[PDB]
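Bench log, entry 3. Co-assembly request; chain sequences pasted below exactly as received.
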Amino acid sequence: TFVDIHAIQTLPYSNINRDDLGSPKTVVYGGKERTRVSSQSWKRAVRHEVEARLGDKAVRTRRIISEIAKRLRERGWDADLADAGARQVVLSVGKKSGIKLEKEKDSEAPATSVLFYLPVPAIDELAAIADEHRDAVAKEAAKKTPKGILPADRITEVLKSRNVSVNLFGRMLAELPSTEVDGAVQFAHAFTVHGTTVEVDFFTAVDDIPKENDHGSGHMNAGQFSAGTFYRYANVNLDRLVENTGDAQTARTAVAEFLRAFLSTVPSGKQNATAAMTLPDLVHIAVRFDRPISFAPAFETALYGSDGYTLRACQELNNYAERLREVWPDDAIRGYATVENKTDLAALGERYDSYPALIDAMVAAAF
Amino acid sequence: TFVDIHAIQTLPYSNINRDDLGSPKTVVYGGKERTRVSSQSWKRAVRHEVEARLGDKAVRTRRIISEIAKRLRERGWDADLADAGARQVVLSVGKKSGIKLEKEKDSEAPATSVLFYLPVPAIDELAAIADEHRDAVAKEAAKKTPKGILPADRITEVLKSRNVSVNLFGRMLAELPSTEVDGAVQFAHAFTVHGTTSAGTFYRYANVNLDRLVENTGDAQTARTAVAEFLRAFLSTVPSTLPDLVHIAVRFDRPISFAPAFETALYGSDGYTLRACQELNNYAERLREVWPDDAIRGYATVENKTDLAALGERYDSYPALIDAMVAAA
Amino acid sequence: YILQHADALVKRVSKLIVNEPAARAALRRGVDPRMLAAHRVVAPYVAVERAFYAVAAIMAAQPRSARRPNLGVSLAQAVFDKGLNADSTEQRLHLIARQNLDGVHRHLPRLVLYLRSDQVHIDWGILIRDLARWGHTPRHVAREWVQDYHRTLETLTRQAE
Amino acid sequence: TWLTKIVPDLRYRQTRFRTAGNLHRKLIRLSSDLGEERIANPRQQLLFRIVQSHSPLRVDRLGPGYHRNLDPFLADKGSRVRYRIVASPTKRLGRSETQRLGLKTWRGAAAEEWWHSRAAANGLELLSTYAQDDVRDPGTADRSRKIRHPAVRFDGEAVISDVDAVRHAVLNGIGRGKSYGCGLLSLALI
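Structure output for the full assembly:
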């Protein structure tokens, strides 16, 4: 019921995720600092591939009023009535008079206090419910302190609609606790197997038309990048995911596309400047029934170096996998797919020649 | 929809780009330091070859006021009126009163705070817009703190004009987000295949998101010419030798770099060309095995000692290869 | 005391970085055996030892574009003047103020080197003696840094009346 | 010759290694029996990089808490080698009111020109290049003054063309300012 996927994937001079100051994020793990890609960023890349591939798109936005206002304006409303109607949509919710709103921006509708995470068609249905009450809204727009008119139960039931991204990663809305959905996927922070010092490349921008003082000055900013072989891990709690989606078949499609997306996507962080696209060197999906088990302790001892880390990392994940299957006996269905042929890697179960075969076979192996 | 080109190219005594102290930039990759040529330098050389070959020239400059002032002076304006008019052109744009300007330098008009990336004819249109308002400029030069008069929307529309270089590499100017263009080309940092304690065999990689490039240029034939000329520039040019091997692939699902192929640093003592070609071949086969796909591959090499089977159908020459697969997209 | 040798390091080193590249590149690689190439320049003037070596190296790893007040006042003035993010530099200040002697030298380089990016003035001598003051009064120096930051931010905002 | 890695420190906490001239002096003071055989027009018969010597060095004040010797007779032209040299590429010009100017095209390519001239018949090889130091004496009388020297660090692979000629280059040094850190040419078998 716990599909957990492990992966080793090198990235060359990537600098996929920067702090606010441009340095790649680092974990001092095992006593040595090692650059990492934050889980939330990669989780966003995965969710964008999943929504893009499965066709249902979710929208995490703080300015829902403006978008609903755009739909009502395309529905034939004048701009002011569209704005007032969308304000009624967001005014009609919450314990208190309404959802708290951020300070008004000139020329545009105010942004809501909390971020919303709902499918696009749900926005369209909110527009329709706001549409059928055109006259009540017309009379109600004139008052100085307008009150909520829309039925609270219908709109709140609309805000409960779940996307695949919502079913998989969950959502939270403090003001509307009825809509909160617990996420079914755990995404670990991918850190480097080996210790990496941040290498700074001094870069300059050439002014095309020659000027004597500036070219001679040659004054420029510094950009910090880093490279290394990341370890990646993720869990999928299948029973809870089936409760969220409801059907087991939709959960299956969600899982297959999620795993494939997990392998395929890369966060895209300064990728025009540097091409960090890359397929994982090793993938090991296991279907654990008792509990998900990450292999991060395997790499708590930083690798020394001087030689290519990919092969040594794969062998270390292998020995650690054998030792854990010995120490914690289980009937969990394991399986892996690798590019290198130098080793058999006996502990990672039966080998599959390709990633889609592995993913489809083991996900089919779980339901 | 993703044309990605790989290439291995040795460079003899190049030392093309130095850090601020002159040492070639190095990556400690795979645990061992390997000299590299930065992506920004090659991207600049490539864009200069593309602009030079297609005839359309883009200009990334911080001192636009001075150049437009020079054109207006050639249009018959007095020097002071040319300076005041160009100051009005750049003052009349942006949210706040105008684009921020650096402290004035003696004998010349002040340089703008941010670098501009616009075509040369766009400069000519800016000169014309500053020209048609001659009386407003003549009256407006006398006040102590002059404000912008030229229409801001039209000027932003001239600044929105895209060169081939802008369509290909993209631009950024924080103050006018209407003009921003997302780049369609990813350019990897060329590092040495082997560890080097300069000369060596650099591995080079680049992506072209054809669909985004088609959205930027709009038309598909001009996108085709842009791509072909870009690939040709990438192979022919050297930042200031022909690449020993080139492997273009047309990936529909995703671009895949072969940098992990060289994560194991090469030992040395023997010519790296042969071992590098064999390693890229072996890694390409294994990746096509692990990730099945219908991507159209193709390569071109000078050596005939091997028939790298995994790199698809072999083409005898660089232009034949580029033309066949670019025509295939 | 300490500040006297610190000033010797600031002038002497301030000249070697801007003057000789090989030394600049040999000391900047240590921002452990990997920094021994740096001793040849800094070792003779030296918890304080860790302070001197680290601050000289970090001071030396700046871009050329960057080549008695404290660090908090320099940060607040950098926020108000250069327009850096205030709330975010705020949490980084609050994270350094808790570190130990070994943590200051690992959390410090990003903010100080990035602060000197976009030409922010930084009095390296005071910073050196501050890194020396972690061996005896870590919490005290931390409190001074933070207090200086908020007080000078407030006064700079109020003087813009 | 013989190769050794020594370290110099500053003797007290006030810096009474601050300058280049003092580095020269400190280097020569650690070799007792010294000789100098000069010829007009060519070079002279130690060398250093920021150490190769003819006589046995013995540790002096504020040095290491411990004290290799090579001859190139052991074991060929054609072979590639590892390299690093710190030198001063120059041009000699007439100055208003002669002189030594660094620009000898000025840029990397002029520096490689400097290479074919400086190496000549010896070894054709991979010199890492950059074209881009100030010093003054501590006061000692009749001991130089103050000025500026520009050093460079070449790194790469060479091919040998005339073993004994390479021996001449390695032992005499290549370029001016050998006494200010420059000159020592290091090669290594691939």
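Strands of chain B lie at 2-11, 26-29, 32-37, 58-61, 116-119, 185-187, 190-192, 200-209, 245-251, 296-301. Residues 272-290 of chain B form the longest helix (19 residues).
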